[model samples]
Target: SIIDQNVQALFNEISADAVFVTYDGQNIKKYGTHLDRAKTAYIPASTFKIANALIGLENHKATSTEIFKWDGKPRFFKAWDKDFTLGEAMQASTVPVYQELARRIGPSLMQSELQRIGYGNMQIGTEVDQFWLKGPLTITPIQEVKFVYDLAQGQLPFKPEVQQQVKEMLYVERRGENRLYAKSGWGMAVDPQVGWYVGFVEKADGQVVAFALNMQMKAGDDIALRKQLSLDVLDKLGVFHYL
Candidate 1:
């Protein structure tokens, strides 16, 4: 695929370790700095919300149609909200609502699901109100790519109904002749800053492609730069080909 060639060129130009692009369930190509140590875990940021949302819906703790009033303020320490449906919380990326959903689902269930899904490094503390970012959520480029693929294929470690709900919710909307669904995450640690984008495209031809990209840098310059690089690479690779 053209995506593979374009991505390889990006890796060479940027001189970054490990670039990967996949279509459908196949790895179109990958270029590497390191596959092992490079796969170190980082903060999941809001992407973890995907798991949080799934647990809530499957356990009947929350419904898609449920609605909650946003208090219109950001709470750094905890999620504060009068009410919000699972779907609204997702669309708004409201931490308070998601944190509350995590509390409702409890730590044991959340941890169990993560472990079951092969995310053994996932760390949710004793309190749902606590920030999981204190410690990083470890994921490799390969693992991140695989997770989305499993999600698109209905093979994640969750109930089929719950996965379906997540698939529907994560999708942004139809773009041209294709459907786009994606999530982006940004976070800061003591040292490296992190940014992530993961999602899938359902082509007009009825094929679904899953892709994920992650970057760790010391400066904020990496955030938008990496995203734009991915967008340009995708475009050059003939994202239009699918549509």
Candidate 2:
């Protein structure tokens, strides 16, 4: 079913410069202000948490259940100010906890893993912990969908157990036998900023639709649309019927 108009209308409603691209097993569907937008790269922001979690697990630096004792330092986000497990930190998108894990993983190993995963442009810059959030390490929307598709299918170079653990962390919901996993990211380091939602839905019937959405975001824009818009695109594509 070709539903480009319906999907494009969703983006028009928001009047934002956005791109939504999906890979359903063998084919790809793209819709947005411009097709080339899907090929443009941007900082990953919190979406890098999935990769960080995998690397930490693979290196034995952190376990899914490991507790991160918050130093009691006040944080801009109240949800991040207390103790949390790795999974909990992911759910809250707690930056400090992941940054701590990145520092523990260190620059050398982190750079290797980033290269190993063929992540983005493989530019880690000089900062061990801030690369994904700030600059240099950029990934295209199409690349994001491809990366998560591999992660969803256990096809990445990481250990199976490590990939499975990160997948568990991304679980957002389930309907019937279908499971949805996703991550949203807000790159505040750039002008206009960039918001993202990237993940896949595993249908009970065995089909999978992995998607990535990135948009120019302003201070007053609804950031939740990062995920909502992606899901709407999926819904219009008929994936949500299976979900």
User: Which prediction has the highest lDDT against the true structure?
Assistant: 2
Candidate 2 structure, TM-score to reference: 0.96
For all candidates, the clash counts are: 8, 0
Put down candidate 1 lDDT per residue, 83-166, tens digits, no spaces. 667665665567777777788888788778677777627666676645444453556555666777778778887789888888
lDDT of 2: 0.87
- Shift in Å, residue 20, candidate 2: 0.2
- Against the true structure, what is each candidate's TM-score? 0.79, 0.96
Local accuracy of candidate 2 as per-residue lDDT tens digits, 181-213: 999999988876988988999998878899988
Cα lDDT listed for each candidate: 0.65, 0.87
Stretches > 4 Å off in candidate 1:
1-5, 11-18, 31-38, 71-84, 217-227, 240-243
Q: Cα miss at 55, model 1 (Å)?
A: 1.4
Off-target runs (Cα >4 Å) in candidate 2 are none
